[PDB]
């Protein structure tokens, strides 16, 4: 993975030695070159993973997450260069260095062969994200939101540290390749009960679990646009990646430990979706929709069937692209009206027709329109949870009504109706903004032509 | 103070710690602690205000009580063993008295009650000596008597130090009291792993001394003793805010920093010995230390508190203070985790 | 540095270079007392280094190229706007007075640095011991608030305690009438707006507070405006003073070494001038502070430490 | 009153000083080169050649092989009368059982 780690590190002298008018264009160019090189991870086999070294490997789970991670950095640079145009030059370079450092932590989070190196990178991803939210967020509440984002994660994850070192002492290793072959059945006990909780609650916070999700509609709202893109597109998927690695070690106890959490997600995706019906803050509406979509990934991991893991990784990649595009659209209005209130600027299809087409496509992929990979992941999780219990389709289908209802109401409030009369600074869409929308949406629609690369280790 | 007298007194502080470290007789241990206290009292009274006299009086009383309990532990060892070798003690009463004496000399809770006062009463350099150099001699004596230290006593001292040093710094605005409660919590972390693996005790001591010396060197280089005067640093020297940011994130044990290195290794040595609840509650209580570190980073680096007009005059002068080893200690307190297996040099 | 503990160890004592002529003399008086020639006259009779009265741009004169900076970088205050609108809403009165106290503190540090490094006495004009006489004269006229007086007393309490008083204070007895006569003969259109009660408050805090508290810690010489015209009488009075008061008597090499270490570190001199008391007349918010600081970095010769500026022609930077 | 503060700056319009602005920068040459870099290295390079790369992957996770291999095995055992799939994955001769 060192062919991806060293170019990401060389982005640091690339961004600190550039000319002052050149520090966006060079980083965008070479991050796009790294994302072009990211397709060499697709050397995946039907039997074996692509095992690079003692430290790094990549199966078909980490590979779409790595391509999405290396693809999201140029899009974050495009999104975050307008509102940081008036910024000091050294602080602008520090912002770009925090995004580069976060990508550098993420690409060896997803490729960590050993689980405590996974933990170290997985918790190293806090510090650039925390600094970005609490330094380049706009409002007052970013300090409090950074505290919530920090201390839900660490309160969930410092038990995970003790649990991983306990597995290290018991099994002798935390190599995932060794633990594929040395995994022992985890019997029913209270010791193994709190073992399961210490392995799972950090990722339950990262997904987020409903009830633990309170950090998210602050940390995804009080952040700048690049922070919201990396949080909702990648950093919610560290939890699903970690669960799909760690439930190997937690059998057969998971088969009854999952029952409360599944309820917390199956009811949670009813509640949070319903919350999106009555949100005034558009960025908070996208945040509670993110909680609603990640509840399905929690259910699909906790029922641990093949169709569920395929649908869960498809839904994670699809939700990454979709929610990142939705945050970028909310920023495209917020750079014009300077308020995140959704009822403020209405009827924007009368003024921005192509941007309203981007809103339409993002909302149709949000409501899981076939044959988008949003619907592929949605539908496969629905199939596997129907095999889990035939009643859950009700809680699925009612969700699939409300998921439609907030996706179009967001379209109806922002883009339709009569426009707001007193707002007259609605500029035409810049080429940068439509470029960002197309670089979100065109990969998302091209993946419908060949979805087997985003279906994970057991396609 | 005369610089020659200052040099001779600081060499006498060092000589007291050395005589504790290198001697094989308990009387010379007690003599080294006496020499250390006797020489460090004028370092605390360097500026001659009533706060330094109060701090030196409180320091004298606690260290004198600890020295007398130390000598009673030594004398009881002489009762029950007839000899004087600095090794395990031959009576649990002498072990308890010596563990109490060294917990007083380290200022571990519930004998912590002098550490935030005395550190507030003295200058920043003498506070640096008190919070770094004055740990080395009692931790050496604890290193040599660990076959006789009671487990329950030293673990009670450890968890009580971690919890009290956690909750103490949450109410503070003075930087010296913040560093003092940080000291109490870190000494709890160092003695919680003493009977399990003393190499990780030495590791935590070295990483703590590096991070503490970095923070006191930054506080001296910016002449800052309160939070609210540290908040003017971005308008005076914007590099120092980045330095206190990375060093306060390192003292909280956030990976990939070096201060994640000890406590992780401490957990790594406490689960081998089948203690799971204890390092878990220790690591959960370390979030309090992290919280007031995050409070300081919000006040200093990640936001910009308003400054005054006279700061514009201080823009026209560069810092002529000798920032001794400050880039070295900044690097060694942040970027050291990829060199974590270097700890075998402490075995 | 140049001087430190090692130079004190290696034999540089300051009582070696401390002759009888090494006297710190501060010349005081009202706004047009005409003392400025007298001070210079004393400095050309005794071989003393004269320091002019510190305005806004004293720190600008000591640093960089020595030329005055624009007013947004230094001061953020105008003397002429205080002359025009003393009760102005923008808080320019106490902001000007606090910047003047900082400038006089820097000047007094330079005075003690010269006196302790060379042994040549220094003539000052209105040192930090005689700055509050303007402040009270503003406060008695309602030009500042009581919070400004409390802030000044805090900064003065933690700054003037670190230093020694002058050896000689020379005061010039001038009535308010002669002050206004010399103001009207001066021609400054702003300075003629000074009220008579302001000058009367200046003279009352002079004769009521300053000289009665400085007669114990040093030697006052109080001349009238016509006998201050003869410099040789004043210098002959100075040369026959029996110095018996003030803490200049009990100064060994150790205390004056500590004082010389203080006055050569300018950011420690100016440490507690900017204490974080949030007073609206001096508090600069974060956006203005960031903007003015980033503009100050872009001034020529001001981006780096002084010997490290390519743009003003510093060489051998890769070997420094 | 309140402290010495800069007033709220206006939001800038990149179309006033530059009606052909692409939204990247206020310098027009920098703006147009940022546009060309994003559109070439994003669309012409990563999207087009990336979809060409994904479209022509060498039998991604060997599914095609597994069809053709299956087309061997059925064709082997349609002839020999063997059942097309055994219910036992492993040979029962090489399995010891726990007796009772």
């Amino acid at each position: 993975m060192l062919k991806y780690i060293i170019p990401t590190m060389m982005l640091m002298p690339l961004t600190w030695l550039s000319k002052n008018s050149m520090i966006w264009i060079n980083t965008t160019l070479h991050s796009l070159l790294i994302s072009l090189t990211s397709l060499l991870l697709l050397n995946q086999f039907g039997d074996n993973s692509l095992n690079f070294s003692l430290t790094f490997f990549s199966d078909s789970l980490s590979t779409p997450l790595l391509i999405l991670t290396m693809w999201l950095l140029p899009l974050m640079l495009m999104a975050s260069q307008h509102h940081l145009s008036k910024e000091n030059l050294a602080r602008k370079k520090l912002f770009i260095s925090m995004l580069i450092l976060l990508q550098l932590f993420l690409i060896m989070t997803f490729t960590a062969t050993e689980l405590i190196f996974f933990y170290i990178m997985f918790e190293a991803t806090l510090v650039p994200t925390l600094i970005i939210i609490t330094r380049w967020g706009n409002q007052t509440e970013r300090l409090n939101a950074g505290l919530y984002f920090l201390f839900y994660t660490l309160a969930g994850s410092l038990p995970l540290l003790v649990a991983l070192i306990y597995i290290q002492n018991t099994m002798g290793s935390l190599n995932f390749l060794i633990l594929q072959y040395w995994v022992q059945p985890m019997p029913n006990s209270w010791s193994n009960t709190f073992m399961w909780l210490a392995c799972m609650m950090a990722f339950m916070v990262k997904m987020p679990l409903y009830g633990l999700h309170l950090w998210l509609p602050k940390a995804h709202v009080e952040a700048p646009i690049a922070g919201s893109m990396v949080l909702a597109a990648i950093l919610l998927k560290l939890g699903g990646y970690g669960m799909m690695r760690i439930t190997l070690l937690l059998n057969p106890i998971t088969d009854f430990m999952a029952y409360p959490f599944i309820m917390l997600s199956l009811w949670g995706m009813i509640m949070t979706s319903s919350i999106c019906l009555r949100q005034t803050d558009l960025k908070s509406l996208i945040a509670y929709s993110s909680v609603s979509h990640m509840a399905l990934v929690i259910v699909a991991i906790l029922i641990q069937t093949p169709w569920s893991y395929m649908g869960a990784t498809a839904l994670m990649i699809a939700h990454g692209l979709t929610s990142s595009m939705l945050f970028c659209l909310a920023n495209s209005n917020y750079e014009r009206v300077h308020s995140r209130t959704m009822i403020l600027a209405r009827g924007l299809q009368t003024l921005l027709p192509l941007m309203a087409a981007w809103w339409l496509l993002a909302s149709l992929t949000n409501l899981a329109l076939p044959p988008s990979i949003n619907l592929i992941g949605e539908l496969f999780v629905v199939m596997s949870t129907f095999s889990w219990s035939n009643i859950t389709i009700i809680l699925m289908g009612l969700n699939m009504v409300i998921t439609a209802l907030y996706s179009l109401y967001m379209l109806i409030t922002t883009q339709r109706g009569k426009h707001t009369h007193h707002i007259n600074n609605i500029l035409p869409s810049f080429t940068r903004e439509n470029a960002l929308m197309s670089l979100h949406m065109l990969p998302l629609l091209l993946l419908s032509l060949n979805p087997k690369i985003i279906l994970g280790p057991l396609y | 103070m005369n610089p020659i007298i200052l040099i001779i007194i600081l060499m006498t502080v060092m000589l007291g710690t050395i005589i504790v470290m290198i001697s094989t007789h308990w009387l010379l241990i007690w003599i080294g602690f006496e020499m250390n206290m006797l020489a460090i009292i004028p370092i605390m009274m360097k500026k001659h205000n009533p706060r330094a006299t109060e701090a030196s009086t409180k320091y004298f009383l606690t260290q004198s009580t600890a020295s007398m309990l130390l000598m009673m532990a030594i004398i009881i060892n002489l009762m029950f063993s007839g000899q004087w070798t600095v090794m395990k003690l031959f009576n649990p009463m002498a072990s308890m008295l010596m563990t109490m004496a060294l917990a007083m000399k380290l200022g571990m809770a519930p004998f912590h009650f002098w550490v935030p006062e005395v550190t507030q009463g003295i200058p920043l350099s003498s506070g640096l000596i008190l919070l770094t150099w004055q740990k080395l001699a009692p931790m050496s004596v604890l290193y040599q008597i660990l076959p006789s230290i009671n487990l329950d006593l030293i673990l009670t001292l450890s968890i009580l130090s971690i919890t009290i040093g956690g909750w103490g710094g949450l109410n503070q605005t003075q930087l010296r009291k913040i560093m003092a409660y940080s000291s109490i919590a870190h000494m709890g972390w160092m003695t919680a792993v003493l009977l399990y693996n003393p190499t990780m005790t030495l590791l935590n001591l070295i990483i703590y001394i590096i991070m503490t010396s970095t923070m006191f060197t930054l506080f001296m280089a910016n002449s800052t003793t309160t939070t609210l005067s540290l908040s003017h640093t971005w308008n005076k020297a914007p590099i120092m805010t980045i330095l206190v940011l990375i060093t306060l994130l390192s003292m909280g044990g956030l990976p990939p920093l070096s201060g994640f290195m000890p406590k992780w290794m401490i957990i790594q040595e406490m689960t081998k010995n089948d203690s799971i609840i204890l390092p878990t509650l220790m690591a959960i209580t370390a979030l309090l230390n992290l919280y007031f570190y995050m409070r300081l980073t919000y006040s200093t680096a990640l936001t910009m508190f308003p400054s005054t007009n006279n700061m514009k005059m201080k823009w026209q002068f560069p810092t002529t203070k000798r920032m001794t080893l400050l880039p070295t200690m900044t690097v060694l307190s942040t970027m050291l985790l990829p060199l974590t297996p270097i700890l075998s040099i402490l075995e | 540095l140049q001087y430190g503990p090692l130079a004190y160890i290696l034999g540089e004592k300051t009582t070696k270079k401390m002759t009888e002529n090494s006297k710190l003399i501060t010349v005081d008086g009202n706004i047009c007392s005409g003392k400025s020639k007298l001070a210079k006259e004393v400095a050309e009779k005794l071989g003393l280094k004269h320091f002019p009265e510190a305005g806004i741009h004293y720190a600008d004169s000591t640093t960089g190229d020595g030329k005055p900076l624009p007013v947004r970088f230094s001061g953020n205050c105008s003397l002429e706007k205080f002359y025009d609108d003393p009760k102005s809403n923008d808080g320019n009165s106490y902001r000007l007075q606090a910047w003047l106290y900082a400038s006089r503190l820097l000047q007094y540090a330079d005075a003690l640095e010269h006196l302790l490094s060379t042994g040549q006495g220094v003539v000052l004009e209105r040192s930090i011991y005689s700055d509050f006489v303007f402040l009270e004269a503003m406060y008695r006229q309602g030009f500042i608030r009581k919070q400004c007086v409390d802030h000044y007393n805090q900064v003065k309490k933690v700054t003037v305690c670190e230093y020694l008083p002058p050896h000689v204070v020379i005061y010039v007895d001038v009535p308010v009438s002669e002050v206004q006569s010399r103001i009207q003969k001066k021609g400054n259109p702003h300075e003629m707006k000074i009220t008579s009660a302001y000058l009367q408050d200046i003279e009352n805090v002079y004769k009521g507070t300053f000289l009665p508290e400085m007669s114990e810690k040093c030697e006052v010489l109080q001349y009238s405006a016509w006998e201050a015209e003869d410099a040789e009488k004043v210098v002959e009075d100075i040369q026959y003073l029996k110095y018996d008061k003030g803490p200049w008597l009990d100064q060994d090499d150790r205390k004056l070494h500590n004082l010389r270490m203080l006055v050569q570190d300018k950011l420690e001199v100016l440490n507690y001038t900017s204490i974080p008391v949030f007073l609206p007349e001096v508090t600069i918010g974060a956006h203005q502070s960031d903007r003015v600081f980033q503009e100050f970095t872009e001034l020529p010769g001001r981006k780096y430490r002084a010997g490290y500026n390519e743009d003003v022609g510093d060489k051998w930077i890769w070997l420094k | 009153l309140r402290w010495q503060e800069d007033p709220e700056p206006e939001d800038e319009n990149l179309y006033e000083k530059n009606p052909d602005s692409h939204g990247y920068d206020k310098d027009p040459a920098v703006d147009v080169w940022n546009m060309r870099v994003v559109f070439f290295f994003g669309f012409s390079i990563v999207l087009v050649l990336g979809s060409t790369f994904v479209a022509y992957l060498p039998d991604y996770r060997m599914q095609e092989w597994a069809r053709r291999e299956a087309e061997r095995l059925v064709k082997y055992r349609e002839a020999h009368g063997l059942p097309l799939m055994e219910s036992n994955c492993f040979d029962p001769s090489k399995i010891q059982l726990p007796e009772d």
């Binding site: 380049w136 409002q139 | 503070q172 508190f305 | 974060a286 | -």
Partner: peptide, 19 residues
């Protein structure tokens, strides 16, 4: 429109004898 930076009321919360 610009970034919120702390005011005097925010800053005085960190300037007491205790927090």
């Amino acid at each position: 429109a610009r970034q919120w930076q702390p005011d005097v009321e925010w800053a005085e919360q960190y300037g007491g004898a205790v927090m």
